Structures are given as C-alpha cells and as structure tokens.
Amino acid sequence: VKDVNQQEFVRALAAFLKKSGKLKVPEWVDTVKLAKHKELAPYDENWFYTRAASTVRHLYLRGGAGVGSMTKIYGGRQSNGVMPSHFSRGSKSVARKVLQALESLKMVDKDPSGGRKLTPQGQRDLDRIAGQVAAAS
Amino acid sequence: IKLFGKWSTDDVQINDISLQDYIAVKEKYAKFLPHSGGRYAAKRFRKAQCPIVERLTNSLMMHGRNNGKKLMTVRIVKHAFEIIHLLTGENPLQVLVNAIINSGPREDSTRIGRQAVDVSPLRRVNQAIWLLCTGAREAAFRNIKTIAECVADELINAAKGSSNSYAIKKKDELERVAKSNR
Amino acid sequence: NLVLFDKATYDKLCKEVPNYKLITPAVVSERLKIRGSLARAALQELLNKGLIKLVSKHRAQVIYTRN
Amino acid sequence: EKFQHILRVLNTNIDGRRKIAFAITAIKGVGRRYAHVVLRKADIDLSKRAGELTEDEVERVVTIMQNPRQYKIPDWFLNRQKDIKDGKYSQVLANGLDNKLREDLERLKKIKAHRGLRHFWGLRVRGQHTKTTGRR
C-alpha cells in the first residue's frame, strides 16, 4: 500500500469498499460518535467505509493489532472544558465491529499470536487499489 | 539554479547600502525553504546571516497560540508569496526586501530622565520585520481576510510606500518624533 | 453577510470576479457582501467551467486567478 | 428562490440563514448532537440552509424531534429519560423544557431535599466551593 499517498489511498479504498456492497455497516452508524472525546458525529455519511479502508491499511503496515490497538490508533485529544486536555482512546465497539466487517470479506483473519492480521486476499486487494491511485496520479 | 521552488533568488537587488549586508537573500543564503534552524541565536551577529524569509517566518509566530508552530508560518509565507506574485508580477522576494527598505526606521528617540539617536543597520531590519508581522497580525485578528492575504497586503503596501501599511505608519511616526526631539 | 445569491449579486460574480488579480473566497466575500461559505462554493463552480484558474489549494487558503 | 429568513418552529424563531443542522439548535431541548440525528433519520441533505427547506420537510423534522423513539432513536440519546413520575422516555422541547426544569426544582423543594434548598437559597448545588467563586 506504500509508494503512493496514504490519504488518497484510504479514500479510493473506501470507494472500492463501498462499490463492493458487502460490508456489514451496523444499524447504529447514524447515532454513534467515533470516540468519547468527540463532540459531534462524523460529517461524512459513509464514515464506516472510510474507517474500514483506513483500518485494513494499518493492518497491512503493522499486523496483529487487535481492537485495543485500533482504539489507540484512532484516539486523540480530549477537551475537558476548563481543565487541561488529555489523550483519549477511540471507540471500542466501533473498532470491534469494523474489524469483524473486514473478516466477512476474507481480508482479515485472527492472528495466531496476538489479535488480527491481514490475509493474502486482503493483501492482494490493497495492492490493486494501491496501483489504481498510482496510475491516477 | 537555486530557488524557493518557483521563485528565483537572483535578480533581487538591495537599494540601501546599509541594509545590503544585513539582508541574506542572494547567492549565499538561498534555500528551498525558510526553515533551516541554523542556531542563529548563538552569537552577537549571527541573525544577520539568517535569510529574511526565515526571519519573516520566525516573526509570524508571535502569540501564546502560535509559539512552536513554524510549519504553519512557513505555509503562510509560502501562500503570501503566491498572493504577492499574483497581485504584482514582480518577484515576491523583491517585494519583501523592498518592504524592509521602507519599514526600517533610520532614527529613533531615547528617553532621558528625550533625545534623537541613530539606528543600527541590524535594528532596522529587526524592527522592519517586527513592524510588518505586527501589522498583518492585527489585520486578521477578527476578519474573514486570511493571514496569507494580510501578509501579502502588508508587504506590497510597504514595498510601495502607500502609507497604508501598518509598518509605514509606525516608521514615519518614530521618525517624526525624533525629528522634533533632536 | 449574504447567505444565498441574488439575481443582482450572482450576475455581479460572473462578470467582474474572473477579471480580478487575486481571486480568493475571502476577497470576493468582502466586496460582494456574501458569507465565506457561499463565496467558497461559488468560486469552485467557476473553476469547473474555466472562467478562473487555480494557483494553489490548501485547507484554509485557496488561491484562484484569471485566465 | 422562496427562501425563508426566519422560520417559526415550535414558537421559536429559527434563523433560516444558518445551516439546517445548527439552526435547529436554537430550539431549547435540542443541541448539536440531537439536531444531527433527527436530520439523519429524516433523509434530508445537511448541506443546505434552514430557509432552503420546503414546508413539508420542516414538519417532518418536528415529528421526529417530538417523537424520537418512534423513529429509532435510542433511550440514551434523550435529555428527559426515565422520568420520576411517568417514566416515559422523551425529548422535552422548548416549552416542555422549562416546565420540566421548573417542576423538578419544585419537587426537590417541597420535600425539603438538600439540592432543593440550595436552589431556593440561590447557591451552588453540586458541591462547588462558594468561598471565592460565584460572586455574580
């Protein structure tokens, strides 16, 4: 997935992941916000496709992450009002349901040592999108 | 050829012979970016060798909010030179050096407990960049006009002596006080 | 100030703005008395047609010019 | 055309010039989070002003705004949930918010509870130190 821009990679991979209408996309994608340190829900309607494209991209670079790791990857600063701001982990159920959605596409499997890693099928699909963004740039 | 990337460093002349030595632009201090971190705050006259595009970048980080945010001000100077080259077809590096020529107070007054005294060539460029960045900062505190526009307008008006630049109004104010207190 | 274009304002945008030296969602918002949201989306339409060009695009700084 | 500068929704002037997701927040009892979810259930483009809405689309928002549970909005999203009297999970609107905010203050007062007496005395009720702060 390297050799290309990682910000346009997750946008083109999400379009491929949405055009391939097989993702789970739970029912509460319209009510949940992605973290307790967030004030509003994601502006984009298809945030579950954007996060799934970015999540499978992190597993390509650092396998065996798991839900606890993706919760830390997508964490950020938490404004506490009149108190100083600290780091806050992301959502656990959002990170867990987006990991199981990638497993339904046979792109992610349970890592034998730790959590979940990338499959040879997912590694192939990610490299195909990585070739499309290179030709389109 | 050495450039910022699109804007050439040559053909940038300096009118005042005084500031010709304390303005680092051509043939020796030409870098692709106004960000090198060369430890210029080490000796007495090390900042005189620092490029004025980086000194303009360092002076735009002036508030408790902007401290330690230089890649932002590099982007501001990068976008300001785009507006400068767009408004005036001349070289943006020429507009910045011409702004220092007109924003440098030649004389100042000191308090005695006044008295007009001369201004060193280094304090001219030191105060010119200070007056230029102060005017563009106050012009964008509450305004839809972005900082890249305020910095560009602060520099094109100073390079032309339009008397609308905040630096020109302050430069003429400090001189007329020393003119009456000499 | 203005949130949606009017017949007297929209025609004012399409005839004299493409003739400006600096075209920016901030400089066209001050003289047309329109808000930055409308001024930003309006300049994106002129870029698609071809009346204006694009000098440099960024998060909070989009610089257009004339053909 | 046919733009509405000031909308009258639930006896509350809604600025039509603002975005649809934030102009609703002028109604008491709804905020930036509850406004987005109501406008998410009712399929309406969020990239339009409040005055750009048709009169039919506005009335559909008021239905979900007053009946959130019917349009699949969970109970944890409501501001008046598990009421002490009827236990009806609901979203108190502009007029109903002040009637609810005033009622529970009267209930905490007639029973002579501590948090009710602190309200009647015009003091901090959540344990704040009032020695140096709260001086108007």
Place this chain on the structure above:
Amino acid sequence: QSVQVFGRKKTATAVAHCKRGNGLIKVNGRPLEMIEPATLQYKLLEPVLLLGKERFAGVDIRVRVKGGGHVAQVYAIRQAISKSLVAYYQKYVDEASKKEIKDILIQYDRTLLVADPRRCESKKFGGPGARARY
C-alpha cells in the same frame, strides 16, 4: 559493497543503508517524496537537488528512522542520506569525488554532515521548565 551511516537530530536516529544499484531512495520502505510532512519535502530533497541525481543513480538508499518528532526525523533523514553518500564515496570511490561532494554539502548547510548537540534541558524545581520560574 554498502555502508550504514546514521543521522541524529534531538532524538531522531535515521540510519541510511547506501548500497550499490539504481537511484532508489526510500525511508522505511516509502519513497522520499512520500513522507507525510509536505512542507518539509524540500529539506529531504536537498542532498539530491544539490548533488544532482547522477550521483545517486548508482546507489540505493533505505533509511530507517525512529525517535524524535516529525521535524526531527526530517533533518535526520537528510543528514543520513548526505553522510551515507560521503561514506560510500570514501570506501568505494576515490577520495577526490568525496571532497567534490563534501564541499557542496558543507558550503550549503553544515547540518547535513555534522549533527548539532542541542538537546532538551532538565527541568528545575520551582519552575515550569528549564529556565522559567513560578
């Protein structure tokens, strides 16, 4: 035929593996022009823009970076790439070509071949930082 030279910023240690081959310059597997900070993209290309691509067209460079921040890794990568070519031109090419490379990189900016020893100072009690007090 390969050298491994490290460049050190405050805490960013970038080690460049200059090995013979084609003009490949990658940082942690990613190309040099693909590093996340685009504002500092020219700082990473200074060893290439000054020395020219013809000097790098015979060696592959694979930089591995860890430590420090975003900006510290930028100055550590360009320093590792600058010194890896110098150390390569010293052990496998003549010394005359080494001086032809060093005089170009030193005259532009000495921080490409010499690391600055500036590090964070220890905090003193009675103050918010190293120098400042309450």
Place this chain on the structure above:
Amino acid sequence: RIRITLTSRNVKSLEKVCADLIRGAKEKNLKVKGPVRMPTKTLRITTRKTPCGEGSKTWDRFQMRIHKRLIDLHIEPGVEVEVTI
C-alpha cells in the same frame, strides 16, 4: 547452558566479579558469552527537603542505580548472583 545474572549498585565491584567469572571459567575451556550489559535502572526519589512547609520549594533528588549484567556459559559484598539453566 547456564545463565548467570549479576546485579549490583556499584559498577566497579560488579565488573570485578564479572571479570573473575569469565576468566575463572575461560581457563576451564568453557565457551562463554560476553557480559551482556542490561540498561541501568535509576531509582528516582524526589522529596521535599524541609520537614515542614516553610522551605522555599527546594526539592532534593535521590538516585539508586542498579546495574545488571548477565553471563551465559556452556563474589564481593553488594553484588547479587543468580544462576539459571
């Protein structure tokens, strides 16, 4: 294979028994691995100097360094020895 762990608070006495262990075992024709020096541990304790609250916020920093070296082969006061398999 035997791994000998050596932990002490003074490097001079810790390397003194470390050299005698390598030299004492090298004469027995035993292939030994060199002394692997674990990262030193500094036990920081920053206390308040004054036994009351009148001091001018003067803190005193204490350190207790614990150096660790292991020897894998196939004693002075202040040095801990622990052999394994």
Place this chain on the structure above:
Amino acid sequence: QPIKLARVTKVLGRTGSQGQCTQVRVEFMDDSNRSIIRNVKGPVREGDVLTLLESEREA
C-alpha cells in the same frame, strides 16, 4: 538637506542610563573627512553603514 550615508569605523562605548545607545565615531564615505561621532541605538559593530538623516550636529 540630504540624507547622508556614513560608515562605522570605531566603537567607543555605551552611553545612556541603561546603556541602550552606543557612542560610535562614524565617518562619511564620500570623502575621508568629517569623522563625526554619533549615538546609535541597537547592535553596532565596526564596519556598519549608518543612514544619517541629519549630519550637522555632533551630539
């Protein structure tokens, strides 16, 4: 009167209550004569070129 251009040749010392003005003997560049002494505000060293707006009085 024109704006005269002088060059710093010798830095004498620091003047002023707080030592903010440096007393410098500044000669002119058009001719070797007129080695006047001026009070300069800011960092000055031997070799600087000053822009004298008024060069009549010594002070």
Place this chain on the structure above:
RNA sequence: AAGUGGCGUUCAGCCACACGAGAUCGAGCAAUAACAGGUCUGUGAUGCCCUUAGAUGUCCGGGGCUGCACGCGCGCUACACUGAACGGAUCAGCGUGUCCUGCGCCGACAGGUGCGGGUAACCCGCUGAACCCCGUUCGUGAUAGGGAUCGGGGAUUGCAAUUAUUUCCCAUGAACGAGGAAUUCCCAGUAAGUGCGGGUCAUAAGCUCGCGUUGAUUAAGUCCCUGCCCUUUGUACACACCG
C-alpha cells in the same frame, strides 16, 4: 582560550576566525557567620507545663475541615479563521507495574466478561501521545468561539458519595471581543505551545516533580530603578537602630 588575527602594563585576559562532536552545559556539593527564620502536627529527638479515666489517652458512629454579602495569592480555560469542529496521515522520551495491561466477545459511551502475559531491555510495548501535517465543511457574527452554571439518566471505586468521589450520555449555553493602576518569569533546543510519566492514589490532577515534542523575538549591555556586597566616613550604638 590549543591554533590564527586583533585589542591589552603586548602581562592577566578579551574579541574575531580556522579546525572541530563543543570554543561559557545542567544539576549536585557548597566557607566564616547570622536569624529569636520554619518545624514539639515527621520521629519510641526532647525540657517544662497541662490533661490523665465523667480523659486532651483510645475506639466506634455522625458532622466539620467543601460551610459564603466580600478582599487577595498561585493556577487552568478562553475571548477564535495564526481558529472550533469532522475525517486522513504521521512522529517521542522519562518512567511505573503483583499491580501494569495485552487479545477474543458485550455495549452508543462509560462499563462488563472469559482467556492471557509480565516481579520485567523479555509482557503492556515498535509505548501508533498530543500539538503538528493533509482534506473537509463552518465565515465581523457572544457563532460550529467560550463549556461556566443546572436538569434527566447509565456505570465504576468502596463498608458507605447526600454537601453532586470520579466517569459517560443527552440537554442547559453564563461572564469573557487581549484586560485599569500595577506586577511576574525569562538569553537557546531557552521562552512559549503541546502531550506523556512519576509523586498523592480503594476512587484520583486544574497541583507538583520529571520527560520528550514543536520551537522563536530580543539582548552579548548598564547602574537608571529596585536589591545586596565592599571601601571610605560618622556614632553617646556593642542586648549592637527592633539600639
């Protein structure tokens, strides 16, 4: 202050340069002597006095130290577009761990639950920190700035939270448009921004001790102010001008 140049009783040294990882790096320790400085509430350090069984011993309940017309002292958050949000991407170090925590499930979050690892360069952990960077909407607007004040609920800690222990969710959306006279800190990886860790800790940071990150403006000077030091001078002071 080794080399070179210059300034100097061509001395002590200073300034500028070449070379070089550096050309004043940051603590600790710290004399003679003084205070009626702090500490009996750190001590099974302690004189004396006082209380000694209806106790000032000691235990267990409940309350208080949080009480609020107010006058101040350290702080945090702000007054935004050099920005808030939403999303993408991408980088630390100090250090702790019998409690620190990893994975698979449950939940919107806070949680819960089973299986695990680590008495540790081994596991947490390649500490995927934040600011920052790149997109995306917001557009003088007391506003998508600010999140104070209150309502209704979900949890966790513990024997037990009401005077809300903390935490989460929804709602409520106040003063505050850079701040008077005054006043503080600071000369380079420094100020400042930014987050992390340790101490406190059953529950636990707006404090403090550390850590890295981003990273400047100005200054290489002066007794002008304010502080002490020294010499000279005066003294009827010597418990020493609190004379």
